[PDB]
Each structure stands twice: as C-alpha cells, then as structure tokens.
Amino acid sequence: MNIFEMLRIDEGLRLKIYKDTEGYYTIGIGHLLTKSPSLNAAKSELDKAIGRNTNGVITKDEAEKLFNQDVDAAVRGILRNAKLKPVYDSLDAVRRAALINMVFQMGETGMAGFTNSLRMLQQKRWDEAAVNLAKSRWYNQTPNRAKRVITTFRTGTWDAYK
Ligand SMILES: [Cl-]
Ligand SMILES: [Cl-]
C-alpha cells in the first residue's frame, strides 16, 4: 500500500466528467476541474488540462497522468506550507500518506481549520487527535472516507484499507 493506491481507493476512477460529493465538476481520480456551475466551463478547463479537444471524456492513461501531477502537487504544497511542513516531517511514512490524502481532498486552504488536530498529531497523541479530527464538517459529510483516514492516523498502519 502507498499513497497512490490509497487515494485510488478513496476517489475512484471516472473517465467522463462527473459531479463530486460537493457537486463540483471533476474527472479522473478526484481531479477537480472547477467550482463553477457551468458544464461548459468544466469542459474548457478539461481541454486545457489534457491539451486536446476532449469532449468531456479522457482515457485511463490521461487520468493517471493527472493523478500523478495532482499527487505531486499536493506533496509540494505541504512542503511549502509553514503550518503543514513541520507536521509532515514529524510523521512516520504511513501517517504522512494520511496527511497527503486530506490535503488532496480538501486543499491546503481548508487545512487551516485543522490547526488543533495538527498540533495533536505533531505531539503524537494519536487517540486525542482522532477524536478531534472527527468533530469536523469533513467527517460529517464523508464519514466513511474520513473514518479510514482517521484510523490511519490513529494506528499508523494500513488496516482500514486492507
Ligand atoms: Cl492541470
Ligand atoms: Cl465517504
């Protein structure tokens, strides 16, 4: 198990534009195209991303390519973030994957409301952090996925995914 397999499980794979849990146009493995309500706008962002006229549909290869970029971007984003980096550097490899998944899902920006949890994670207070993580809109909206990530942070193993 690794970050890629883990997100592939959490996000699924779809080759035609779809709306995500928040109802925003997405494609591939969780690749957000835009928060705009315009499907047109969404097809335009997609062609721009793929570099071709796609007509709202991509191949598997293209989705994996977006996915690789997106994972990479998330990691770099973390390393560039003053509030996130220290946390990430303090974690073991499994837990680091858990932090990546969250960022990937939510954006660094939404990462700010998790300040207290982050501190607990840095202090290695696993159960406390697990409890604090669950009091969040994130948990209330996508409870099954949230449970898997939280378990991952709580145990430091991939059991929730196996
Ligand atoms: Cl892109
Ligand atoms: Cl879920």
Side-chain angles (χ1 to χ4, degrees), residues 35 77 81 83-84 102-103 106-115:
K35 312 195 241 135
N81 188 304
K83 290 83 58 236
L84 294 183
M102 283 182 84
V103 166
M106 84 202 113
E108 256 184 63
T109 296
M111 290 306 288
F114 294 86
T115 285

Side-chain angles (χ1 to χ4, degrees), residues 39-99:
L39 176 67
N40 277 332
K43 281 128 135 7
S44 155
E45 283 301 309
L46 180 50
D47 292 336
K48 178 167 46 86
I50 301 310
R52 88 196 163 58
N53 231 81
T54 61
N55 205 38
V57 179
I58 59 171
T59 75
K60 188 157 151 144
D61 272 21
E62 283 169 341
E64 273 170 8
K65 177 137 174 241
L66 288 177
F67 181 41
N68 270 293
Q69 281 173 189
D70 286 346
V71 170
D72 207 23
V75 180
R76 294 298 297 276
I78 278 164
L79 299 174
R80 303 209 202 87
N81 188 304
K83 290 83 58 236
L84 294 183
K85 183 181 155 61
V87 184
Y88 179 84
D89 281 349
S90 70
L91 294 170
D92 53 281
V94 179
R95 297 184 172 87
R96 268 174 196 185
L99 186 65

Side-chain angles (χ1 to χ4, degrees), residues 4 7 11 42-43 47 52 62 99 116 119 128-129 131:
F4 288 98
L7 280 165
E11 293 293 350
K43 281 128 135 7
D47 292 336
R52 88 196 163 58
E62 283 169 341
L99 186 65
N116 302 318
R119 189 188 263 56
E128 294 151 75
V131 168

